[PDB]
Amino acid sequence: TVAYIAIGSNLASPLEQVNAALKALGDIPESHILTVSSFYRTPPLGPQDQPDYLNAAVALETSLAPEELLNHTQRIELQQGRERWGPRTLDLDIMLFGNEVINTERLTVPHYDMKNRGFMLWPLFEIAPELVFPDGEMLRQILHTRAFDKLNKW
Numbered sequence: 001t002v003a004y005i006a007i008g009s010n011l012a013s014p015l016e017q018v019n020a021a022l023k024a025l026g027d028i029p030e031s032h033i034l035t036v037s038s039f040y041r042t043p044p045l046g047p048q049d050q051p052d053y054l055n056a057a058v059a060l061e062t063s064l065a066p067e068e069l070l071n072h073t074q075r076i077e078l079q080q081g082r083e084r085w086g087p088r089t090l091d092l093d094i095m096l097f098g099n100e101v102i103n104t105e106r107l108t109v110p111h112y113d114m115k116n117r118g119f120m121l122w123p124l125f126e127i128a129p130e131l132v133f134p135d136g137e138m139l140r141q142i143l144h145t146r147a148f149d150k151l152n153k154w
């Protein structure tokens, strides 16, 4: 299954944190990285007085169950992390899990607010411009409907 994962961090200098998170993702059992987007520098969604965020997206091929992947992404956040409107040491958000639809206590997939976040959508569109959501919406169509500002690269 191909899972799309959003990565964010606004440690003053988040490159090393993001690279470490990516290595950890690639080390998850029964999983490997297919593609990584460019690194993007985005203004805080929240109080404008914290550092800019580094946002990216990753396509991860995996045989894990969705909640098993979430267990690994949560583990990685704890191991490299340390709030509400930021700053954020490391966030890993499951955007899509193949074509699955999940609405549990622990997991909402597709991700419950990605439709409203250009810093999630634009990096995904880079690595998966043809993506269709489980409900038949097209990523390209969402960006075209909303006209979110394009992102600057890190």
Ligand SMILES: CC1(C)Nc2nc(N)[nH]c(=O)c2N=C1CNCCN1CCC(SC[C@H]2O[C@@H](n3cnc4c(N)ncnc43)[C@H](O)[C@@H]2O)CC1
Pocket (backbone or CB within 6 Å): 007, 008, 009, 042, 043, 044, 045, 046, 053, 055, 084, 085, 086, 088, 091, 092, 093, 094, 095, 105, 106, 107, 108, 109, 110, 111, 112, 119
């Ligand atoms: C401060 C803010 C709004 N401003 C930002 N400004 C820019 N520019 N860039 C950013 O990047 C950016 N980020 C954020 C904060 N994003 C945290 C998103 N995230 C919340 C959900 C979970 S943290 C709470 C809970 O969400 C549950 N969850 C439900 N669905 C999912 C799912 N699909 N993926 C993961 N967790 C799931 C999970 O059980 C967890 O306990 C992990 C992290």
